[PDB]
Amino acid sequence: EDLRLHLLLNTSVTCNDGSPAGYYLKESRGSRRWLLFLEGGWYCFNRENCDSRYDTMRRLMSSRDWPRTRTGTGILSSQPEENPYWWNANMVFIPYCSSDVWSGASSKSEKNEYAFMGALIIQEVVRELLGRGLSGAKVLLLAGSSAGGTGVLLNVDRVAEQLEKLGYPAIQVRGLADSGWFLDNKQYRHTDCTCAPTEAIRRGIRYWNGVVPERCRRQFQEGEEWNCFFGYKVYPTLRSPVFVVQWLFDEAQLTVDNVHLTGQPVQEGLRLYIQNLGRELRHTLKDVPASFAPACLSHEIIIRSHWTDVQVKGTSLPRALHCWDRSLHPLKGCPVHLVDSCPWPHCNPSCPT
Numbered sequence: 001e002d003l004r005l006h007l008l009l010n011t012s013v014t015c016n017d018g019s020p021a022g023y024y025l026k027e028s029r030g031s032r033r034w035l036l037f038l039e040g041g042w043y044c045f046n047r048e049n050c051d052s053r054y055d056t057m058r059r060l061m062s063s064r065d066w067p068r069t070r071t072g073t074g075i076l077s078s079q080p081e082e083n084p085y086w087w088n089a090n091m092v093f094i095p096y097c098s099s100d101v102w103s104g105a106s107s108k109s110e111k112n113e114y115a116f117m118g119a120l121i122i123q124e125v126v127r128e129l130l131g132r133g134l135s136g137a138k139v140l141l142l143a144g145s146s147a148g149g150t151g152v153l154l155n156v157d158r159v160a161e162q163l164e165k166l167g168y169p170a171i172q173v174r175g176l177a178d179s180g181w182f183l184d185n186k187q188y189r190h191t192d193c194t195c196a197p198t199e200a201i202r203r204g205i206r207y208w209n210g211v212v213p214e215r216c217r218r219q220f221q222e223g224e225e226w227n228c229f230f231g232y233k234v235y236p237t238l239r240s241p242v243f244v245v246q247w248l249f250d251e252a253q254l255t256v257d258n259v260h261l262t263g264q265p266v267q268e269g270l271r272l273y274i275q276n277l278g279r280e281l282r283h284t285l286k287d288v289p290a291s292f293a294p295a296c297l298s299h300e301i302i303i304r305s306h307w308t309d310v311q312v313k314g315t316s317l318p319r320a321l322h323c324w325d326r327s328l329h330p331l332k333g334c335p336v337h338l339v340d341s342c343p344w345p346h347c348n349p350s351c352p353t
């Protein structure tokens with residue numbers, strides 16, 4: 001069940017503080033499927049805010065204290081009972097140590113206190129894995145939760161395209177974006193930059209020299225690339241198949257919207273605010289053919305041990321993913337587009353507690 005740490009042999013690809021980035025691996029000799037999971041954990045968009053993260057979230061900025069191993073849970077579990085979907089796959093956990101929503105290509109230098117290399121970390125992991133069996137893969141699934149889910153959307157097509165330019169057109173690259181499908185909406189109550197979703201990314205993307213998918217960049221153009229960090233804007237531009245998993249009432253979305261459900265009766269204005277949020281999230285998913293979006297107030301799912309438990313219209317997430325697999329070869333009783341229509345958190349009775 002354990003994934004072993006390997007630090008990058010290319011030590012110019014680093015975490016924020018210059019320590020080498022890396023990946024946790026568990027090989028499955030008899031398997032042609034590879035799961036590369038991108039960890040999440042917010043971001044920092046300037047020197048002072050990143051110094052604060054360095055004090056108290058240092059494992060998200062540095063490999064110096066990483067454990068030698070890591071237990072695979074949820075979709076990274078090797079036990080069929082916990083992971084009906086891909087229990088036999090080669091499992092890869094890429095720790096998030098660049099604080100840049102996996103978008104940066106920026107070395108630490110005399111002009112940069114921190115390195116922001118998330119985009120380069122992903123490609124270096126892919127490069128170093130080819131020699132550990134990935135060259136023989138038929139499917140590479142690039143998955144990720146929260147900031148790592150947004151990182152899937154920013155990076156899936158780039159992974160596909162290095163594999164093509166490296167002479168491996170047989171590997172089918174696909175994406176699995178969990179809890180990284182955000183809305184650039186108005187906060188419920190205004191705060192000073194809990195930064196509003198829109199302005200957080202504009203400052204971040206400049207600070208990291210972050211990079212976005214090419215077609216999306218060509219649409220929005222210079223200075224407007226922050227737009228590509230928002231799933232409903234970047235997804236239509238992607239080629240690789242991408243499965244979108246998204247709570248309709250994501251906790252991180254509510255946080256940046258300054259919504260705090262601290263007990264007490266919810267008043268009319270907040271009720272309508274929350275109900276409109278779920279409706280607009282549904283609307284952005286209507287033309288996403290492979291998606292799983294339950295009406296729950298929660299955050300992340302695919303690496304939780306009880307990710308098998310949630311259902312939309314009677315179908316679980318591991319089942320929906322298997323059905324997605326079959327569709328990538330109109331299936332009878334094996335749906336891939338599963339979006340709740342009920343309008344309030346936990347109107348779905350299988351929501352997590």
Ligand SMILES: O=C(O)CSc1ccc2c3c(cccc13)CC2
Pocket residue numbers: 040041042043101145146147148150182197198201229252253256
């Ligand atoms: O990693 C976590 O747990 C949370 S990331 C996150 C939160 C909130 C927002 C994000 C946006 C883009 C990319 C990532 C995020 C826009 C608004």
Ligand SMILES: *[C@@H]1O[C@H](CO)[C@@H](O)[C@H](O)[C@H]1NC(C)=O
Pocket residue numbers: 010011012013120124
């Ligand atoms: C190491 O990574 C950097 C950043 O992507 C790249 O420019 C360089 O060519 C790599 N070096 C080797 C030896 O792979």
